[PDB]
Design a protein around this ligand. Structure first.
Ligand code: A1A05
Ligand code: A1A05
Ligand code: A1A05
Ligand code: A1A05
Lengths: 341, 341
């Protein structure tokens, strides 16, 4: 299991990441750096690390082993951690915006006592640490500027998607008319697919000298289609998954979210079916949640998902056959096997 | 008035800034871009634009007029606007953290109805726009990477200071023991001086080919000492200024802030004077505010400020005489004349 082999060394490298981001020439800022230590430890640790590890795995698959020295690996781990800090920045902030209670089975940072909206500044420091790391480890490298720009573009794309999400589903203002498929695909593309699929692979490519605009265009065609499928999967499993399988528990309906399900549900309705969803979707009560689930069931939406999963598997295989070269197909396929739940 | 000459053209260029940051190949994100237009217009417009204009004025003073073509000026205006967007990013967010009501005599963005904590994402888009602008206007230039890194370093330094501020004065937890001078100088240095004084001049230098580590070290020695003085000035004027002069009205005492005044006040106290400040500083009531002001008065703190202003003027002149070369002294002096209130 190629990801499980690399994990040990990756998660150990965190010690050094934090040591270096807090390494004492200016004793005056001690107290803020301490706080920075605390923010990293609480927010970068505890996930599965899929995105970060994809950098280290791709790097191994993309570089000639002759050219995989100790330095090269330190940089790969670091850039991997950069991806993880990006995620930490987004999540700290999104949890504030969504009024979330927990994240990874523990209290969101901003809910922790004495933190509150100070978390906004903490999220910003998380983003800042990316560019500090890139500079400490990669300034002298020929791909240095490509990475800076790739992280920046990835932040912008994610923010644009978050904006589009916030527009599509305002807390307190339940409206289903703007839960369209065109709109769903866009949110997923910008809000998750880009930084979760494209970014880690693309960081790997750059680090191995692969900076062709055509090569990157091709990786991206594949990786976006992948990330779309994997988000639709999570939406499905949110409801119809056993929570032993998932790890979450499915609040998408109480939270009035733009899930793939409710979208597809919306397309397959006599006018009278809409009124039941208007009535039930978003409410605290549990009997209400049940009537929504029963509804999606009586529209054989599993059958619709199953069909989507077939077609999607076929298309992605085709893409990989057509556009992976000159990359090894196992960079894409290994990712798919790792994220499939 | 060198700043008043450049203002017209600078503020007109905003039209183009916004046109370009919202310029339609991807119709799917229309709705988020619209929102981006709205965020820029509300948050980048309405200030004095000192920081932004310092880029355009310095550029004129630093480049040989032969080499000040139409392109060169577009880039100067743009980078100026980049500074202004940085400010917009910080202020949108700081207003959330401080639970501010108004900013520039109007409702803070996050208080505007339908915005709320969505403003966090909006602040982030403001930061993102800097790097989009830098790329659209400067990618091909030899100073491109220096600007990217300068903006990033400036964000980090500001955030670190904001962290140190948040630590020093927690809303709800009034403690004066950590309002020390060493701590005050640090907050000002990182939170304001760097990005308000050093950054705009340094962006100008880079754009004119001045990338020496020694030249930048020297500009910075001057500009930090300047920014320190100008913040101490604002603290003073917050209380002892006529508000016809200032434009603000002095809430620093109700808001339990780490002002230069309260700091210096703390150093000049029998133990019994502290108890009056413990008692009065931070409270809603007005009679309480008065007893604080009366206190600072009876410690001849104007006399202490006056002395500080003399010594400070002398030191800054000395710095400029010693370290401005090979820059023209009028870049520093013009800045001082523009910001002195
Ligand atoms: O037990 P499930 O996972 O629910 C089962 N699924 C499968 N069963 C046997 N082979 C495959 S191969 C496969 C699959 C793998 C990857 C992908 C997407 C393309 C990718 F890799 F991104 C899509 C479908 C699913 C799949 P079903 O729901 O089809 O009954
Ligand atoms: O009886 P098999 O079909 O061979 C069964 N397979 C599965 N069963 C229930 N869900 C999934 S999902 C799945 C799967 C996931 C990803 C992929 C493709 C390689 C990749 F990860 F892109 C192919 C198949 C297989 C798979 P087994 O492998 O446990 O024997
Ligand atoms: O009417 P105020 O402004 O209050 C008056 N101030 C001055 N009066 C006549 N010349 C100068 S030159 C001067 C000054 C200018 C710049 C600076 C700081 C160095 C810098 F430029 F950054 C410090 C002091 C103040 C100053 P006072 O408070 O000293 O009575
Ligand atoms: O009677 P003057 O001393 O000549 C009087 N000057 C001032 N009066 C009250 N506040 C200030 S603050 C001030 C000032 C500010 C900045 C500077 C130095 C050049 C710089 F902006 F660094 C020098 C003096 C002069 C100044 P005027 O200029 O209106 O005639």
């Amino acid at each position: 299991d190629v990801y499980a082999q690399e994990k040990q060394d990756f998660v150990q490298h965190f010690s050094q990441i934090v040591r270096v981001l807090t390494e004492m020439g200016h004793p005056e800022i001690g107290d803020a750096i301490a706080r920075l230590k605390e923010v990293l430890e609480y927010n970068a640790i505890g996930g599965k690390y899929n995105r970060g590890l994809t950098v280290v795995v791709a790097f191994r698959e993309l570089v000639e082993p002759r050219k995989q020295d100790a330095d090269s690996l330190q940089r790969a781990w670091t850039v991997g951690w950069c991806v993880e800090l990006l995620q930490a920045f987004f999540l700290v902030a999104d949890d504030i915006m969504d009024s979330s209670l927990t994240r990874r089975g523990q209290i969101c940072w901003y809910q922790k006592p004495g933190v509150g909206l100070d978390a906004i500044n903490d999220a910003n420091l998380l983003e800042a640490c990316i560019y500090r790391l890139l500079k400490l480890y990669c300034r002298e490298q020929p791909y240095y500027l490509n990475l800076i720009e790739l992280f920046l573009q990835s932040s912008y794309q994610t923010e644009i998607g978050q904006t589009l999400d916030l527009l599509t589903a305002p807390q307190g203002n339940v409206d289903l008319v703007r839960f369209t498929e065109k709109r769903y695909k866009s949110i997923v593309k910008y809000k998750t697919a880009f930084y979760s699929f494209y970014l880690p692979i693309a960081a790997a490519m750059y680090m191995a000298g692969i900076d062709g605009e055509k090569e990157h265009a091709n990786a991206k065609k594949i990786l976006l289609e992948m990330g779309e499928f994997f988000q639709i999967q999570d939406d499905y499993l949110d409801l119809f998954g056993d929570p032993s399988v998932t790890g979450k528990i499915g609040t998408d309906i109480q939270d009035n979210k733009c899930s793939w399900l409710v979208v597809q549900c919306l397309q397959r309705a006599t006018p009278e079916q809409y009124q039941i969803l208007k009535e039930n979707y978003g409410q605290k009560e549990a009997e209400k949640v049940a009537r929504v689930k029963a509804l999606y069931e009586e529209l054989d939406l599993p059958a619709v998902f199953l069909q989507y999963e077939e077609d999607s598997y076929s298309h992605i295989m085709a893409l990989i056959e057509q556009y992976a070269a000159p990359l090894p197909p196992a960079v894409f396929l290994g990712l798919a096997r790792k994220i499939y739940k």
